[PDB]
Amino acid sequence: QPMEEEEVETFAFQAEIAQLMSLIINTFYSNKEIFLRELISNSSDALDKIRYESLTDPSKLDSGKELHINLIPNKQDRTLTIVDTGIGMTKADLINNLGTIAKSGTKAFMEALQAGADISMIGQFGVGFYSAYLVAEKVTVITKHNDDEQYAWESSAGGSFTVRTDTGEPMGRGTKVILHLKEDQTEYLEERRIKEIVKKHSQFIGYPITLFVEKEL
Ligand SMILES: COc1cc(-c2cc(C)nc(N)n2)c(Cl)cc1Cl
Protein backbone atom coordinates (compact mmCIF):
# COMPACT_ATOMS: atom_id res chain seq x y z
CA GLN A 1 0.00 0.00 0.00
CA PRO A 2 2.87 2.48 -0.36
CA MET A 3 2.21 5.53 -2.55
CA GLU A 4 5.65 5.06 -4.10
CA GLU A 5 8.35 2.41 -4.06
CA GLU A 6 11.70 2.62 -5.78
CA GLU A 7 15.06 0.92 -5.76
CA VAL A 8 18.00 3.07 -4.73
CA GLU A 9 21.56 2.05 -5.56
CA THR A 10 24.57 3.30 -3.62
CA PHE A 11 27.97 3.42 -5.34
CA ALA A 12 31.43 4.23 -4.04
CA PHE A 13 33.36 7.00 -5.78
CA GLN A 14 36.58 6.02 -7.50
CA ALA A 15 39.42 6.83 -5.10
CA GLU A 16 40.78 9.88 -6.90
CA ILE A 17 37.34 11.43 -7.35
CA ALA A 18 36.71 11.01 -3.62
CA GLN A 19 40.05 12.72 -2.97
CA LEU A 20 39.14 15.65 -5.23
CA MET A 21 35.70 16.07 -3.66
CA SER A 22 37.17 16.17 -0.17
CA LEU A 23 39.75 18.77 -1.24
CA ILE A 24 37.11 20.96 -2.86
CA ILE A 25 34.42 20.81 -0.19
CA ASN A 26 36.79 21.36 2.75
CA THR A 27 39.42 23.78 1.45
CA PHE A 28 39.19 27.56 1.54
CA TYR A 29 39.19 29.30 -1.83
CA SER A 30 38.47 33.00 -2.28
CA ASN A 31 36.89 32.69 -5.73
CA LYS A 32 34.10 30.16 -5.21
CA GLU A 33 31.76 31.88 -7.67
CA ILE A 34 33.48 29.99 -10.48
CA PHE A 35 31.19 27.02 -9.80
CA LEU A 36 28.38 28.67 -11.75
CA ARG A 37 30.60 29.24 -14.77
CA GLU A 38 31.57 25.57 -14.72
CA LEU A 39 27.99 24.32 -14.49
CA ILE A 40 26.78 26.66 -17.24
CA SER A 41 29.71 25.49 -19.37
CA ASN A 42 28.65 21.86 -18.87
CA SER A 43 25.09 22.75 -19.85
CA SER A 44 26.34 24.51 -22.97
CA ASP A 45 28.34 21.41 -23.90
CA ALA A 46 25.25 19.23 -23.40
CA LEU A 47 23.19 21.59 -25.55
CA ASP A 48 25.82 21.47 -28.31
CA LYS A 49 25.61 17.69 -28.25
CA ILE A 50 21.86 17.33 -28.71
CA ARG A 51 22.01 20.08 -31.32
CA TYR A 52 24.74 18.22 -33.22
CA GLU A 53 22.73 14.99 -33.11
CA SER A 54 19.63 16.81 -34.38
CA LEU A 55 21.48 17.91 -37.52
CA THR A 56 21.27 14.39 -38.93
CA ASP A 57 18.17 13.34 -36.99
CA PRO A 58 15.51 16.03 -36.33
CA SER A 59 13.34 13.59 -34.35
CA LYS A 60 15.95 13.88 -31.61
CA LEU A 61 14.14 17.11 -30.77
CA ASP A 62 10.69 15.56 -30.39
CA SER A 63 11.43 15.86 -26.68
CA GLY A 64 11.79 19.61 -27.08
CA LYS A 65 13.26 21.98 -29.63
CA GLU A 66 14.18 24.83 -27.30
CA LEU A 67 17.83 24.78 -26.31
CA HIS A 68 18.39 26.91 -23.22
CA ILE A 69 19.69 27.19 -19.67
CA ASN A 70 17.59 28.13 -16.62
CA LEU A 71 18.89 29.32 -13.25
CA ILE A 72 16.51 28.88 -10.33
CA PRO A 73 17.33 30.17 -6.81
CA ASN A 74 14.97 29.06 -4.03
CA LYS A 75 15.70 30.88 -0.77
CA GLN A 76 13.14 28.84 1.17
CA ASP A 77 14.83 25.53 0.26
CA ARG A 78 18.26 27.18 0.16
CA THR A 79 18.84 25.61 -3.26
CA LEU A 80 20.18 26.93 -6.54
CA THR A 81 19.29 24.83 -9.59
CA ILE A 82 20.87 24.95 -13.03
CA VAL A 83 18.59 23.43 -15.68
CA ASP A 84 19.34 22.73 -19.33
CA THR A 85 17.52 21.08 -22.22
CA GLY A 86 20.71 19.43 -23.41
CA ILE A 87 21.34 15.81 -24.28
CA GLY A 88 20.83 14.42 -20.79
CA MET A 89 22.21 11.17 -19.40
CA THR A 90 21.26 7.51 -19.15
CA LYS A 91 21.58 5.59 -15.89
CA ALA A 92 24.83 4.10 -17.19
CA ASP A 93 26.05 7.62 -17.98
CA LEU A 94 25.42 8.76 -14.39
CA ILE A 95 27.18 5.79 -12.83
CA ASN A 96 30.09 5.87 -15.28
CA ASN A 97 30.60 9.61 -15.67
CA LEU A 98 29.69 10.89 -12.21
CA GLY A 99 31.71 8.74 -9.88
CA THR A 100 32.93 5.22 -10.60
CA ILE A 101 35.34 5.87 -13.48
CA ALA A 102 38.10 8.45 -13.10
CA LYS A 103 39.57 10.09 -16.20
CA SER A 104 43.21 11.17 -16.09
CA GLY A 105 42.07 14.75 -15.54
CA THR A 106 41.03 14.06 -11.96
CA LYS A 107 44.54 13.23 -10.75
CA ALA A 108 46.03 15.77 -13.15
CA PHE A 109 43.97 18.61 -11.68
CA MET A 110 45.01 17.81 -8.11
CA GLU A 111 48.59 17.66 -9.32
CA ALA A 112 48.18 21.06 -10.95
CA LEU A 113 46.83 22.58 -7.71
CA GLN A 114 49.76 21.15 -5.76
CA ALA A 115 52.05 22.70 -8.38
CA GLY A 116 50.47 26.11 -7.82
CA ALA A 117 47.62 26.24 -10.32
CA ASP A 118 44.29 27.88 -9.47
CA ILE A 119 40.99 26.08 -8.89
CA SER A 120 39.43 28.25 -11.61
CA MET A 121 41.32 26.04 -14.07
CA ILE A 122 39.20 23.05 -13.12
CA GLY A 123 37.17 22.98 -16.33
CA GLN A 124 40.26 22.40 -18.45
CA PHE A 125 40.55 19.04 -16.70
CA GLY A 126 36.97 18.01 -17.40
CA VAL A 127 35.88 17.84 -13.76
CA GLY A 128 34.40 21.31 -13.33
CA PHE A 129 31.13 19.79 -12.08
CA TYR A 130 32.71 18.99 -8.73
CA SER A 131 33.33 22.70 -8.14
CA ALA A 132 29.67 22.62 -7.09
CA TYR A 133 30.96 21.45 -3.71
CA LEU A 134 32.71 24.79 -3.19
CA VAL A 135 29.25 26.15 -2.31
CA ALA A 136 27.02 23.10 -1.85
CA GLU A 137 26.86 20.53 0.96
CA LYS A 138 24.78 18.24 -1.24
CA VAL A 139 24.25 18.02 -4.98
CA THR A 140 21.37 16.31 -6.76
CA VAL A 141 21.41 15.72 -10.50
CA ILE A 142 18.14 14.92 -12.24
CA THR A 143 18.54 13.88 -15.85
CA LYS A 144 16.49 12.67 -18.83
CA HIS A 145 17.91 11.32 -22.09
CA ASN A 146 15.89 10.48 -25.22
CA ASP A 147 14.27 7.03 -25.06
CA ASP A 148 15.24 6.63 -21.40
CA GLU A 149 13.54 7.27 -18.08
CA GLN A 150 14.35 10.10 -15.68
CA TYR A 151 17.04 9.47 -13.06
CA ALA A 152 18.28 11.22 -9.93
CA TRP A 153 21.92 11.14 -8.82
CA GLU A 154 22.83 12.48 -5.38
CA SER A 155 25.87 12.89 -3.15
CA SER A 156 26.89 14.79 -0.02
CA ALA A 157 30.53 13.87 -0.73
CA GLY A 158 30.77 11.10 1.85
CA GLY A 159 32.71 8.83 -0.50
CA SER A 160 29.50 7.50 -2.06
CA PHE A 161 26.59 8.59 -4.25
CA THR A 162 23.11 7.20 -4.90
CA VAL A 163 21.15 6.65 -8.10
CA ARG A 164 17.38 6.11 -8.39
CA THR A 165 14.48 6.67 -10.77
CA ASP A 166 12.97 10.13 -10.44
CA THR A 167 9.18 10.30 -10.76
CA GLY A 168 8.57 13.76 -9.33
CA GLU A 169 8.19 16.16 -12.24
CA PRO A 170 8.88 14.77 -15.73
CA MET A 171 11.43 16.67 -17.81
CA GLY A 172 11.22 16.55 -21.58
CA ARG A 173 14.99 16.16 -21.96
CA GLY A 174 18.08 17.52 -20.25
CA THR A 175 19.70 17.86 -16.85
CA LYS A 176 18.99 19.70 -13.60
CA VAL A 177 21.82 20.23 -11.15
CA ILE A 178 20.38 21.09 -7.74
CA LEU A 179 22.81 22.69 -5.29
CA HIS A 180 21.85 22.42 -1.63
CA LEU A 181 23.90 25.38 -0.48
CA LYS A 182 26.17 25.55 2.55
CA GLU A 183 24.83 27.84 5.26
CA ASP A 184 27.39 30.59 4.63
CA GLN A 185 27.06 30.47 0.84
CA THR A 186 23.52 31.83 0.47
CA GLU A 187 24.71 34.92 -1.42
CA TYR A 188 24.34 32.84 -4.59
CA LEU A 189 20.58 32.91 -4.12
CA GLU A 190 20.48 36.71 -4.56
CA GLU A 191 19.49 38.11 -7.95
CA ARG A 192 22.26 40.73 -8.03
CA ARG A 193 24.91 38.10 -7.31
CA ILE A 194 23.73 35.61 -9.92
CA LYS A 195 23.45 38.34 -12.54
CA GLU A 196 26.93 39.73 -11.94
CA ILE A 197 28.50 36.26 -12.04
CA VAL A 198 26.81 35.39 -15.33
CA LYS A 199 27.75 38.76 -16.83
CA LYS A 200 31.39 38.32 -15.84
CA HIS A 201 32.03 34.66 -16.69
CA SER A 202 29.39 33.41 -19.13
CA GLN A 203 29.36 36.23 -21.69
CA PHE A 204 30.25 33.91 -24.56
CA ILE A 205 27.72 31.15 -23.92
CA GLY A 206 25.64 30.80 -27.07
CA TYR A 207 22.29 29.86 -25.54
CA PRO A 208 19.57 31.82 -23.73
CA ILE A 209 20.15 31.96 -19.98
CA THR A 210 17.05 32.76 -17.95
CA LEU A 211 16.57 33.46 -14.25
CA PHE A 212 13.48 32.11 -12.49
CA VAL A 213 13.24 33.39 -8.93
CA GLU A 214 11.31 30.70 -7.03
CA LYS A 215 9.09 31.33 -4.02
CA GLU A 216 6.49 29.01 -2.51
CA LEU A 217 3.41 31.01 -1.53
C1 LIG B 1 31.90 16.06 -18.04
O2 LIG B 1 31.58 15.82 -16.67
C3 LIG B 1 30.28 16.01 -16.21
C4 LIG B 1 29.17 16.43 -17.01
C5 LIG B 1 27.85 16.61 -16.46
C6 LIG B 1 26.75 17.02 -17.34
C7 LIG B 1 26.30 16.15 -18.34
C8 LIG B 1 25.24 16.59 -19.12
C9 LIG B 1 24.70 15.71 -20.21
N10 LIG B 1 24.66 17.82 -18.93
C11 LIG B 1 25.15 18.63 -17.93
N12 LIG B 1 24.55 19.87 -17.74
N13 LIG B 1 26.19 18.26 -17.12
C14 LIG B 1 27.66 16.36 -15.06
CL15 LIG B 1 26.10 16.56 -14.29
C16 LIG B 1 28.75 15.93 -14.25
C17 LIG B 1 30.05 15.75 -14.82
CL18 LIG B 1 31.32 15.21 -13.77
Task: Say which residues have a Cβ less than 8 Å from residue 209's Cβ, sequence separation at least 6.
Answer: 40, 68, 69, 70, 71, 198, 202
What is the SS3 assignment for 14-49? CHHHHHHHHHHHHCCCCCCCHHHHHHHHHHHHHHHH
Class of domain 1-217: alpha beta
Using DSSP's 3-state secondary structure scheme, residue 127 falls into coil
Residues 46, 86 contacting (CB under 8 angstroms): yes
Paired strand residues for 141: 153, 177
How far, in Å, is the centroid of ligand 1 from the Cα of 104? 17
10 Å CB burial of residue 2 (0-12, 13-18, 19+) is: exposed
Q: Is 84 annotated as a binding residue?
A: yes
Q: What span, in angstroms and rounded, lies between the C-alpha atoms of 142 and 204?
A: 26
Task: Say which residues have a Cβ less than 8 Å from residue 116's Cβ, sequence separation at least 6.
Answer: none
Q: Is 103 annotated as a binding residue?
A: yes
CA angle 171, 44, 140 (to 5 degrees): 50
Residue 136, CB half-sphere, CA atoms under 13 Å: how many? 30
Q: Is the CB of 141 under 6 A from ligand 1?
A: yes
Own/partner long-range contacts of 108-113 (Cβ < 8 Å, ≥24 apart): 109/20, 110/16, 110/19, 110/20, 110/23, 113/23
Using DSSP's 3-state secondary structure scheme, residue 97 falls into helix
Q: Is the CB of 42 under 6 A from ligand 1?
A: yes
Technique employed here was: X-ray
Q: Is 204 annotated as a binding residue?
A: no
Output b/e per residue, 38-60; b: 16+ Cβ within 10 A: bbbbbbbebbeebbeebeeeeeb
Could you tell which of 40, 155, 175 is best to mutate to test the pocket of ligand 1, judged by most ligand atoms within 8 Å of the CB? 175
